[PDB]
Protein backbone atom coordinates (compact mmCIF):
# COMPACT_ATOMS: atom_id res chain seq x y z
CA UNK A 1 0.00 0.00 0.00
CA UNK A 2 2.45 2.54 -1.33
CA UNK A 3 1.27 5.18 -3.74
CA UNK A 4 2.20 4.80 -7.41
CA UNK A 5 2.80 7.97 -9.41
CA UNK A 6 -0.83 8.39 -10.44
CA UNK A 7 -4.40 8.61 -9.16
CA UNK A 8 -7.51 7.04 -10.67
CA UNK A 9 -10.99 8.12 -11.72
CA UNK A 10 -13.66 5.41 -11.62
CA UNK A 11 -16.86 5.42 -13.70
CA UNK A 12 -19.84 3.13 -13.14
CA UNK A 13 -23.43 2.96 -14.42
CA UNK A 14 -26.58 1.99 -12.54
CA UNK A 15 -30.23 1.07 -13.14
CA UNK A 16 -33.33 2.30 -11.33
CA UNK A 17 -36.63 0.51 -12.26
CA UNK A 18 -38.78 3.66 -12.30
CA UNK A 19 -42.47 2.68 -12.84
CA UNK A 20 -43.52 5.74 -14.88
CA UNK A 21 -46.79 7.53 -15.79
CA UNK A 22 -47.91 8.35 -19.35
CA UNK A 23 -50.29 11.07 -20.55
CA UNK A 24 -51.72 11.18 -24.07
CA UNK A 25 -54.18 13.89 -25.06
CA UNK A 26 -57.39 13.19 -26.94
CA UNK A 27 -57.30 12.62 -30.71
CA UNK A 28 -53.51 12.73 -30.82
CA UNK A 29 -53.03 10.33 -33.74
CA UNK A 30 -55.13 8.68 -36.41
CA UNK A 31 -54.70 5.03 -37.35
CA UNK A 32 -55.68 2.82 -40.29
CA UNK A 33 -56.30 -0.91 -39.78
CA UNK A 34 -55.93 -3.66 -42.36
CA UNK A 35 -57.61 -7.06 -42.55
CA UNK A 36 -55.77 -9.85 -40.69
CA UNK A 37 -54.98 -13.26 -42.16
CA UNK A 38 -53.72 -16.75 -41.30
CA UNK A 39 -50.95 -18.38 -43.31
CA UNK A 40 -49.54 -21.91 -43.36
CA UNK A 41 -45.81 -22.49 -43.06
CA UNK A 42 -43.31 -25.22 -42.14
CA UNK A 43 -45.25 -28.47 -42.29
CA UNK A 44 -42.92 -30.88 -40.48
CA UNK A 45 -43.43 -34.61 -39.94
CA UNK A 46 -46.10 -34.43 -37.24
CA UNK A 47 -46.79 -30.72 -36.88
CA UNK A 48 -47.91 -27.82 -39.06
CA UNK A 49 -47.33 -24.22 -38.03
CA UNK A 50 -49.78 -21.42 -38.80
Amino acid sequence: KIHPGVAMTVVRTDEILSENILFSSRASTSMFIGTPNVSRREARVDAVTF
Binding site: R44, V45, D46
Partner: protein, 60 residues
Amino acid sequence: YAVVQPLHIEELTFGAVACLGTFSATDGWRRSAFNYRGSSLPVVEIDSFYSNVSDWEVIL
Protein backbone atom coordinates in the same frame (compact mmCIF):
# COMPACT_ATOMS: atom_id res chain seq x y z
CA TYR B 1 -1.61 -41.95 -28.84
CA ALA B 2 0.70 -42.07 -25.80
CA VAL B 3 -0.33 -44.98 -23.57
CA VAL B 4 -0.81 -47.94 -25.89
CA GLN B 5 -0.47 -47.16 -29.60
CA PRO B 6 2.00 -44.58 -30.94
CA LEU B 7 1.96 -45.46 -34.62
CA HIS B 8 1.50 -48.05 -37.39
CA ILE B 9 0.26 -48.20 -40.97
CA GLU B 10 -3.41 -49.18 -40.77
CA GLU B 11 -3.82 -48.37 -37.08
CA LEU B 12 -3.60 -44.64 -37.74
CA THR B 13 -7.36 -44.01 -37.95
CA PHE B 14 -9.25 -42.81 -34.87
CA GLY B 15 -12.94 -42.79 -35.72
CA ALA B 16 -15.73 -41.83 -38.08
CA VAL B 17 -18.90 -39.72 -38.03
CA ALA B 18 -22.23 -39.96 -39.86
CA CYS B 19 -25.43 -37.90 -39.82
CA LEU B 20 -28.70 -39.58 -38.88
CA GLY B 21 -31.31 -36.94 -39.72
CA THR B 22 -32.66 -33.47 -39.09
CA PHE B 23 -35.08 -32.54 -36.32
CA SER B 24 -36.53 -29.24 -35.18
CA ALA B 25 -34.39 -27.02 -32.98
CA THR B 26 -35.75 -25.25 -29.88
CA ASP B 27 -37.54 -28.49 -28.92
CA GLY B 28 -37.23 -32.24 -29.05
CA TRP B 29 -34.89 -34.41 -27.01
CA ARG B 30 -36.87 -34.59 -23.81
CA ARG B 31 -35.70 -37.13 -21.25
CA SER B 32 -37.60 -40.24 -20.20
CA ALA B 33 -37.07 -43.71 -18.77
CA PHE B 34 -37.19 -47.05 -20.58
CA ASN B 35 -38.91 -49.50 -18.24
CA TYR B 36 -38.24 -53.21 -18.78
CA ARG B 37 -37.56 -56.16 -16.46
CA GLY B 38 -38.18 -54.21 -13.26
CA SER B 39 -35.34 -51.80 -14.02
CA SER B 40 -35.24 -48.46 -15.82
CA LEU B 41 -32.82 -46.74 -18.17
CA PRO B 42 -32.80 -42.94 -18.70
CA VAL B 43 -33.41 -42.29 -22.39
CA VAL B 44 -33.85 -39.19 -24.54
CA GLU B 45 -36.52 -38.93 -27.24
CA ILE B 46 -36.56 -36.71 -30.32
CA ASP B 47 -39.74 -35.38 -31.93
CA SER B 48 -40.57 -34.83 -35.61
CA PHE B 49 -37.46 -36.62 -36.85
CA TYR B 50 -36.67 -36.79 -40.56
CA SER B 51 -34.32 -39.66 -41.34
CA ASN B 52 -31.45 -38.74 -43.67
CA VAL B 53 -28.26 -40.84 -43.69
CA SER B 54 -24.86 -39.79 -45.06
CA ASP B 55 -21.60 -41.72 -45.21
CA TRP B 56 -18.83 -41.81 -42.61
CA GLU B 57 -16.25 -39.02 -42.45
CA VAL B 58 -12.95 -39.84 -40.77
CA ILE B 59 -12.12 -37.61 -37.80
CA LEU B 60 -8.47 -37.29 -36.79
